[PDB]
Design an enzyme around this catalytic site. Sequence first.
Site, PDB file in Angstrom:
ATOM      1  N   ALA A 100      19.700  59.313  26.290  1.00 14.54           N
ATOM      2  CA  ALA A 100      19.208  59.189  25.258  1.00 14.54           C
ATOM      3  C   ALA A 100      19.975  58.184  24.014  1.00 14.54           C
ATOM      4  CB  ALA A 100      18.510  60.240  24.573  1.00 14.54           C
ATOM      5  N   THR A 139      18.418  64.042  29.032  1.00 18.40           N
ATOM      6  CA  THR A 139      19.675  63.976  28.399  1.00 18.40           C
ATOM      7  C   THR A 139      20.651  64.868  28.289  1.00 18.40           C
ATOM      8  OG1 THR A 139      20.586  63.210  26.088  1.00 18.40           O
ATOM      9  CG2 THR A 139      18.427  63.895  26.117  1.00 18.40           C
ATOM     10  N   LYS A 140      21.727  64.993  28.414  1.00 14.21           N
ATOM     11  CA  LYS A 140      22.566  66.297  28.385  1.00 14.21           C
ATOM     12  C   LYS A 140      23.147  66.135  26.870  1.00 14.21           C
ATOM     13  CE  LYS A 140      26.940  63.892  29.058  1.00 14.21           C
ATOM     14  NZ  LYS A 140      28.500  63.709  29.934  1.00 14.21           N
ATOM     15  N   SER A 197      24.908  60.693  20.962  1.00 10.66           N
ATOM     16  CA  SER A 197      25.245  59.857  22.040  1.00 10.66           C
ATOM     17  C   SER A 197      26.377  58.949  21.585  1.00 10.66           C
ATOM     18  CB  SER A 197      24.088  58.871  22.241  1.00 10.66           C
ATOM     19  OG  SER A 197      23.089  59.737  22.621  1.00 10.66           O
ATOM     20  N   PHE A 215      32.654  37.449  13.942  1.00  8.09           N
ATOM     21  CA  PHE A 215      33.377  38.402  14.852  1.00  8.09           C
ATOM     22  C   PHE A 215      33.938  37.589  15.762  1.00  8.09           C
ATOM     23  CE2 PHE A 215      32.394  42.690  16.698  1.00  8.09           C
ATOM     24  CZ  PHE A 215      32.408  43.235  15.484  1.00  8.09           C
ATOM     25  N   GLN A 244      37.536  46.725  29.547  1.00 10.66           N
ATOM     26  CA  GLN A 244      37.811  46.075  28.436  1.00 10.66           C
ATOM     27  C   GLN A 244      38.585  46.840  27.383  1.00 10.66           C
ATOM     28  OE1 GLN A 244      34.996  45.148  24.791  1.00 10.66           O
ATOM     29  NE2 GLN A 244      35.734  43.122  25.619  1.00 10.66           N
ATOM     30  N   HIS A 288      39.924  47.346  23.762  1.00 14.88           N
ATOM     31  CA  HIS A 288      39.488  46.767  22.297  1.00 14.88           C
ATOM     32  C   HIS A 288      40.957  46.420  21.753  1.00 14.88           C
ATOM     33  CE1 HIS A 288      38.441  46.790  18.330  1.00 14.88           C
ATOM     34  NE2 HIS A 288      37.006  46.776  18.622  1.00 14.88           N
ATOM     35  N   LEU A 293      38.364  54.089  17.042  1.00 18.53           N
ATOM     36  CA  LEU A 293      38.109  52.885  17.048  1.00 18.53           C
ATOM     37  C   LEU A 293      38.267  52.305  15.518  1.00 18.53           C
ATOM     38  CD1 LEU A 293      36.407  50.181  18.662  1.00 18.53           C
ATOM     39  CD2 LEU A 293      35.294  51.019  16.533  1.00 18.53           C
ATOM     40  N   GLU A 351      36.010  45.441  14.990  1.00 18.46           N
ATOM     41  CA  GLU A 351      36.622  43.935  14.756  1.00 18.46           C
ATOM     42  C   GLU A 351      36.140  43.400  13.657  1.00 18.46           C
ATOM     43  OE1 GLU A 351      34.920  41.521  18.145  1.00 18.46           O
ATOM     44  OE2 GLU A 351      37.309  41.749  18.880  1.00 18.46           O
ATOM     45  N   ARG A 410      38.635  39.545  22.792  1.00 24.15           N
ATOM     46  CA  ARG A 410      39.435  40.716  23.103  1.00 24.15           C
ATOM     47  C   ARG A 410      40.492  40.758  24.019  1.00 24.15           C
ATOM     48  NH1 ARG A 410      34.904  45.468  21.949  1.00 24.15           N
ATOM     49  NH2 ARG A 410      34.548  44.852  19.497  1.00 24.15           N
ATOM     50  N   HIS A 446      38.146  50.830  26.193  1.00 18.51           N
ATOM     51  CA  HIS A 446      36.896  50.738  25.187  1.00 18.51           C
ATOM     52  C   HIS A 446      35.436  50.623  25.829  1.00 18.51           C
ATOM     53  CE1 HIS A 446      34.639  50.200  21.519  1.00 18.51           C
ATOM     54  NE2 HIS A 446      34.033  49.353  21.913  1.00 18.51           N
ATOM     55  N   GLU A 477      25.302  50.303  28.925  1.00 23.97           N
ATOM     56  CA  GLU A 477      26.859  50.256  29.250  1.00 23.97           C
ATOM     57  C   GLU A 477      26.857  50.877  30.757  1.00 23.97           C
ATOM     58  OE1 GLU A 477      29.983  51.740  26.860  1.00 23.97           O
ATOM     59  OE2 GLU A 477      31.184  51.602  28.491  1.00 23.97           O
ATOM     60  N   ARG A 505      33.486  41.070  27.425  1.00 25.62           N
ATOM     61  CA  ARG A 505      32.373  41.543  26.610  1.00 25.62           C
ATOM     62  C   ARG A 505      32.515  40.975  25.116  1.00 25.62           C
ATOM     63  NH1 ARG A 505      30.346  44.670  22.642  1.00 25.62           N
ATOM     64  NH2 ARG A 505      31.922  46.374  23.052  1.00 25.62           N
ATOM     65  N   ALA A 518      29.719  43.058  19.621  1.00 25.27           N
ATOM     66  CA  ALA A 518      28.346  43.023  19.010  1.00 25.27           C
ATOM     67  C   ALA A 518      27.466  42.527  19.923  1.00 25.27           C
ATOM     68  CB  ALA A 518      28.391  42.019  17.787  1.00 25.27           C
ATOM     69  N   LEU A 577      25.580  46.506  21.920  1.00 24.68           N
ATOM     70  CA  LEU A 577      24.238  47.196  20.988  1.00 24.68           C
ATOM     71  C   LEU A 577      23.163  46.136  21.144  1.00 24.68           C
ATOM     72  CD1 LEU A 577      25.910  48.089  17.751  1.00 24.68           C
ATOM     73  CD2 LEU A 577      24.920  49.813  19.544  1.00 24.68           C
TER      74      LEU A 577
HETATM   75  C1  LIG Z   1      33.167  54.008  22.049  1.00 24.65           C
HETATM   76  C2  LIG Z   1      32.329  52.913  20.873  1.00 24.65           C
HETATM   77  C3  LIG Z   1      31.923  51.862  21.517  1.00 24.65           C
HETATM   78  C4  LIG Z   1      31.219  50.760  20.749  1.00 24.65           C
HETATM   79  C5  LIG Z   1      31.638  50.834  19.393  1.00 24.65           C
HETATM   80  C6  LIG Z   1      32.349  51.708  18.798  1.00 24.65           C
HETATM   81  C7  LIG Z   1      32.710  52.992  19.572  1.00 24.65           C
HETATM   82  C8  LIG Z   1      33.824  54.018  18.871  1.00 24.65           C
HETATM   83  N1  LIG Z   1      31.118  49.892  18.560  1.00 24.65           N
HETATM   84  C9  LIG Z   1      30.228  48.561  18.956  1.00 24.65           C
HETATM   85  C10 LIG Z   1      29.787  47.538  18.007  1.00 24.65           C
HETATM   86  O1  LIG Z   1      29.877  47.555  16.711  1.00 24.65           O
HETATM   87  N2  LIG Z   1      28.952  46.541  18.576  1.00 24.65           N
HETATM   88  C11 LIG Z   1      28.564  46.696  20.094  1.00 24.65           C
HETATM   89  O2  LIG Z   1      27.581  45.710  20.680  1.00 24.65           O
HETATM   90  N3  LIG Z   1      29.095  47.575  20.924  1.00 24.65           N
HETATM   91  C12 LIG Z   1      29.813  48.651  20.220  1.00 24.65           C
HETATM   92  N4  LIG Z   1      30.204  49.763  21.223  1.00 24.65           N
HETATM   93  C13 LIG Z   1      29.876  49.860  22.622  1.00 24.65           C
HETATM   94  C14 LIG Z   1      28.572  50.409  22.817  1.00 24.65           C
HETATM   95  O3  LIG Z   1      28.446  51.257  21.584  1.00 24.65           O
HETATM   96  C15 LIG Z   1      28.448  51.282  23.982  1.00 24.65           C
HETATM   97  O4  LIG Z   1      28.556  50.368  25.191  1.00 24.65           O
HETATM   98  C16 LIG Z   1      26.828  51.663  23.997  1.00 24.65           C
HETATM   99  O5  LIG Z   1      26.664  52.632  22.839  1.00 24.65           O
HETATM  100  C17 LIG Z   1      26.234  52.185  25.256  1.00 24.65           C
HETATM  101  O6  LIG Z   1      25.435  53.271  25.126  1.00 24.65           O
HETATM  102  P1  LIG Z   1      24.293  53.397  25.764  1.00 24.65           P
HETATM  103  O7  LIG Z   1      22.772  53.531  25.419  1.00 24.65           O
HETATM  104  O8  LIG Z   1      24.570  52.848  27.149  1.00 24.65           O
HETATM  105  O9  LIG Z   1      24.546  55.232  25.994  1.00 24.65           O
HETATM  106  P2  LIG Z   1      25.456  56.184  25.445  1.00 24.65           P
HETATM  107  O10 LIG Z   1      25.409  56.031  23.900  1.00 24.65           O
HETATM  108  O11 LIG Z   1      26.904  56.014  25.795  1.00 24.65           O
HETATM  109  O12 LIG Z   1      24.893  57.384  25.833  1.00 24.65           O
HETATM  110  C18 LIG Z   1      24.765  58.260  27.036  1.00 24.65           C
HETATM  111  C19 LIG Z   1      23.514  58.736  27.227  1.00 24.65           C
HETATM  112  O13 LIG Z   1      23.308  59.501  28.696  1.00 24.65           O
HETATM  113  C20 LIG Z   1      23.138  60.508  28.468  1.00 24.65           C
HETATM  114  N5  LIG Z   1      23.770  61.467  29.712  1.00 24.65           N
HETATM  115  C21 LIG Z   1      25.097  60.867  30.221  1.00 24.65           C
HETATM  116  N6  LIG Z   1      25.344  61.883  31.334  1.00 24.65           N
HETATM  117  C22 LIG Z   1      24.346  62.325  31.695  1.00 24.65           C
HETATM  118  C23 LIG Z   1      23.818  63.500  32.523  1.00 24.65           C
HETATM  119  N7  LIG Z   1      24.732  63.919  33.649  1.00 24.65           N
HETATM  120  N8  LIG Z   1      22.800  63.997  32.630  1.00 24.65           N
HETATM  121  C24 LIG Z   1      21.763  63.591  31.470  1.00 24.65           C
HETATM  122  N9  LIG Z   1      21.870  62.801  30.729  1.00 24.65           N
HETATM  123  C25 LIG Z   1      23.419  62.085  30.708  1.00 24.65           C
HETATM  124  C26 LIG Z   1      23.442  61.175  27.204  1.00 24.65           C
HETATM  125  O14 LIG Z   1      22.981  62.614  26.803  1.00 24.65           O
HETATM  126  C27 LIG Z   1      23.175  59.982  26.239  1.00 24.65           C
HETATM  127  O15 LIG Z   1      21.987  59.976  25.683  1.00 24.65           O
HETATM  128  K   LIG Z   2      28.590  47.936  31.969  1.00 23.56           K
END
Ligand SMILES: *Cc1cc2c(cc1C)nc1c(=O)[nH]c(=O)nc-1n2C[C@H](O)[C@H](O)[C@H](O)COP(=O)(O)OP(=O)(O)OC[C@H]1O[C@@H](n2cnc3c(N)ncnc32)[C@H](O)[C@@H]1O
Ligand SMILES: [K+]
EC number: 1.3.5.1
Lengths: 102, 139, 241, 613
Positions: free
Chosen positions: D18, D40-41, D47, D122, D243, D245, D255, D258, D289, D356, D389, D400, D403, D406
């Site tokens: 989620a 979701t966990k 998240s 960016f 990647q 960062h 973090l 950028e 990057r 990152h 991701e 990547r 920006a 997201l």
């Molecule tokens: C770490 C980071 C990344 C980042 C950023 C700043 C930081 C500190 N700033 C960004 C930006 O300005 N612009 C951009 O395009 N990207 C930026 N990033 C990278 C990006 O944020 C991440 O790649 C993106 O957030 C990926 O998100 P995604 O929707 O793929 O999910 P998530 O947020 O990581 O959440 C994971 C979800 O999965 C559930 N989960 C995980 N394991 C389980 C299990 N085992 N069972 C059930 N559910 C699970 C979690 O609960 C969660 O909802």
């Molecule tokens: K990926």
Amino acid sequence: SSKAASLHWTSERAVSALLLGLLPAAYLYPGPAVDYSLAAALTLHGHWGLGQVITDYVHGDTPIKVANTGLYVLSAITFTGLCYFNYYDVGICKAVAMLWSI
Amino acid sequence: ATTAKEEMARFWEKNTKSSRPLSPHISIYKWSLPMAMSITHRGTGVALSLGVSLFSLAALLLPEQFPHYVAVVKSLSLSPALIYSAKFALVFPLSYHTWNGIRHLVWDMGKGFKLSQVEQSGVVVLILTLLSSAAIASE
Amino acid sequence: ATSRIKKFSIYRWDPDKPGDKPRMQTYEVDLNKCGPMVLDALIKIKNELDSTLTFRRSCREGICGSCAMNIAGGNTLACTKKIDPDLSKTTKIYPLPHMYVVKDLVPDLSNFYAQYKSIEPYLKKKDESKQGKEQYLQSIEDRQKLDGLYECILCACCSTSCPSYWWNGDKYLGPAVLMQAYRWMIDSRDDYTEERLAQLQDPFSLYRCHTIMNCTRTCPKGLNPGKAIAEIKKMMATYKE
Amino acid sequence: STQYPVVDHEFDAVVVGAGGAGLRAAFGLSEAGFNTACVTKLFPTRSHTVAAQGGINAALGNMEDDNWRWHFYDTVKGSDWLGDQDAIHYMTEQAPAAVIELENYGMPFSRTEEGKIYQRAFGGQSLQFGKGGQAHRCCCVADRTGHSLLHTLYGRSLRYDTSYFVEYFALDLLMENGECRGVIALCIEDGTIHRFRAKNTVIATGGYGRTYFSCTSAHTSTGDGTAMVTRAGLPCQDLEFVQFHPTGIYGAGCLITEGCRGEGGILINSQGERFMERYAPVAKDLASRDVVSRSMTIEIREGRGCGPEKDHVYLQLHHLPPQQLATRLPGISETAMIFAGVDVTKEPIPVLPTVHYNMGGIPTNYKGQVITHVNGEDKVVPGLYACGEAASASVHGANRLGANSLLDLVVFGRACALTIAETCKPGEPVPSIKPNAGEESVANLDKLRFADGTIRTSEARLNMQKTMQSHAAVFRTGSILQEGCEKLSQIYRDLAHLKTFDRGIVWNTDLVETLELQNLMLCALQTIYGAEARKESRGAHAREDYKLRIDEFDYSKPLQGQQKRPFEEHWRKHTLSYVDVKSGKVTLKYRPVIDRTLNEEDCSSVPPAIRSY
Ligand SMILES: *Cc1cc2c(cc1C)nc1c(=O)[nH]c(=O)nc-1n2C[C@H](O)[C@H](O)[C@H](O)COP(=O)(O)OP(=O)(O)OC[C@H]1O[C@@H](n2cnc3c(N)ncnc32)[C@H](O)[C@@H]1O
Ligand SMILES: [K+]
Ligand SMILES: CCCCCCO[C@@H]1O[C@H](CO)[C@@H](O)[C@H](O)[C@H]1O
Ligand code: SF4
Ligand code: F3S
Ligand code: FES
Ligand SMILES: [K+]
């Protein structure tokens, strides 16, 4: 009206302000007019005031209902007593000047 | 999916019948001046209220009018100190509640909400109370 | 060587331990071989002394709001709270106050969550037949009105610090939720102001707030829930229709 | 046992995760009439997406005339030609629409003087296909765009009948005859087991920066979704492309967006040079990057590192107006202080390249459907989707653009919603699953629950994190990479000596973290073994022992009269990793890179070419 809750709130503060403006009055124009005005304003503010307290701390339909009723009596009897004192005795303002003269 | 109301009703339903404990609060929470002055505003209010209620009753029930009880007091040549004190303990609650009472009406205008302002007003309230009490209890 | 030992008294309880009763357990940690944050300390203990020490956590930079808990009398985020250098003081750590405990420092926030849901924390336009064509117009000025309100991370520190919440938490929304109800009332793009205010016309949702101000003092992002509630009250008294 | 109780759930479709991707696919489905279930966990708003700062790219033109095709170009060049351009076509042409949808939902985007969405500069972003100068198409909400983006989405989802199951841990997929029948999981609140029978499963579980010792990611980015596919006998892709960062604060690794360089902030070493002007004469600090990080890395091990250890560098901001800092970068300003005592208006920020984002992930097509590769042809895995991701479309390839994740999140999350909506129909009979479906998962769970060996969870993990950090960093080499493989393989083996303590089932985070270790290790193996195998330099993968980019042609000279290299002899292709669960042996294969766009007349496919910023 639907806007009851927000109306009660506004009235409360107004009464608060009212009671604050009586203080200056009872010391600069002690007399019947102020005496009774205080009995009324003191009963109302106290009444709405103790209710907010009952509302926060009392729970359960019965207790609630009981607390409110018991409070309704406490108030009405209080407004009554003050008015009695204002008519059959010296009156609030005068009693203070007397107490403070001791 | 459940509604907000369906979740609330089921929240209490599950937890009220569990063996889960309630995390402590009042007994473990740190106090602050504002917080203490807040409870005190309520305490003095209730006391002021009972005081006025205890007065209306005495009026409706005691044998003598007020003037007589005032004499019964004067013919006791009490130490003026004990007199002063009695007058101070008489007007302190009223004093506090009023100033702080004003503080609340100002807040209701949405002014003075910055935390550092809450402290400042709290303290002004505390010196006005003391000053406006000593004075009255002395007149 | 030269260690520097520190004692932490932490709340415990196991639902799987038959007839177990809440209790405090003490742990000693050398601040020289540990991070500066209580979270850092809590994770060290779990990884090296009692992997049964259960608690919530994720971001570790104070933005997800997971590490909410009562650290030394006040609710805060363990991940951004500094460990006290004073070795003569044992730091106690509890779960958020007046909450049903699930296990150790994990509270049941499901009512908190539903309360939020009930204020409809989403944009509602009277004409939604155009959603998806163009950007909605909002001026720098009106956008500024949202500063200090959107930053909220729903950690529940404020609401679980408020005495009224402790007493009527079942009907009183609490600082968190209310400040978000305001977040949508003053959004220049929302067309449901009056309706959002209409919903607060009862003795509990909003009026259980007597300006104690425990909320503002306790907020980790420096928000002022208390002042937001103050402005609502003024709208409640000045709107019509 | 069954020593655990099992509850079977029946849904049209199941969403796992989620975050950005998750929420958007979940309510997209319910918005389409299907009976969706979101597992979701974490509570949605916790998240890792909520931590994002910089922005989300879109060719809106609120700052100057733009063209979504120039955005496309940037990303293809960005991905050192490893990205599937059809995927990149869709992503960049749907962007404006994706962003506007967010603002129409409620997203508090910072505004321009015209009442529109503010966009900043960016890295690796230009106008006129890399000729028209720097671009400004990074839509944002100050430096807390992730926070807002997630908070809005969750808010939007509260309007549909999507059934959520929060703080549920997903164990594995319910596989039958090459198709996905759903997923099995553990309810962490009351310790029960759950199987979700559905006609379609969507996975969006995030990356796995927690395979390393220093990452920006949250303690919850444990590639759980990546491992589930693996245990299914499915291949993960390009997991070796990690990647780093450029700006992750010293000590905490947190973090530093950028966006800083995009508002004027620069890089400076011990002596005070803006070295990036040297490495990247034009892009300077807004170079890619992968490029920038190597630059920092060099200046350090070369002797010009800063600090009392000469191990980091300096990100300067103080030369910029205090008002702009408080208006564009208020977030990092509050972070710097709490984690380095730095005041961005008076002193520099200590930083260094930090793990990152993961470019690699579960392979899918531009429609979010999971694919497998048999005898040289991709084939969709019926009932399985991936986005976020955790997926590899792969719009990002070997590097990547800031920006762009997201953006990817919302674009493909919706795409899974659309593809299913056009493919299947709500209500269709849900597939049957053999009565014992998943007992092995329970099996493992129980075994780890009562584990009592010599090496405790916290110790194993720390061994894994330190090997990745030493044998697979910005700069890599054959010997060092080879050892890291041996080291890891051994650790994966030593997992049989694992020791746990909590014997309970309710909120037993001792157990959960052990399930996550198994998960992180799987991801890590494929990463380092894939790195050792790839002998070439492309994107975030630099081998000092193979300093050139090997394509099927040498695009450094005219193609006329050139012998196109064999598939087997060049590296312009995705990596395909497989893992022997019980033994932990890595198996690799390779598939071609998709270069055709969704429509050639509308968007020209872009051929390889020297990659310099
Ligand atoms: C770490 C980071 C990344 C980042 C950023 C700043 C930081 C500190 N700033 C960004 C930006 O300005 N612009 C951009 O395009 N990207 C930026 N990033 C990278 C990006 O944020 C991440 O790649 C993106 O957030 C990926 O998100 P995604 O929707 O793929 O999910 P998530 O947020 O990581 O959440 C994971 C979800 O999965 C559930 N989960 C995980 N394991 C389980 C299990 N085992 N069972 C059930 N559910 C699970 C979690 O609960 C969660 O909802
Ligand atoms: K990926
Ligand atoms: C129970 C009554 C004793 C508490 C009264 C004052 O308490 C003090 O107030 C100040 C000012 O806010 C705080 O900074 C201190 O931490 C707090 O202990
Ligand atoms: S208003 Fe403050 S304390 Fe309350 S939930 Fe939000 S950030 Fe946390
Ligand atoms: S502490 Fe509580 S009573 Fe009102 S001001 Fe904050 S919500
Ligand atoms: S772990 Fe995210 S708020 Fe602390
Ligand atoms: K409005």
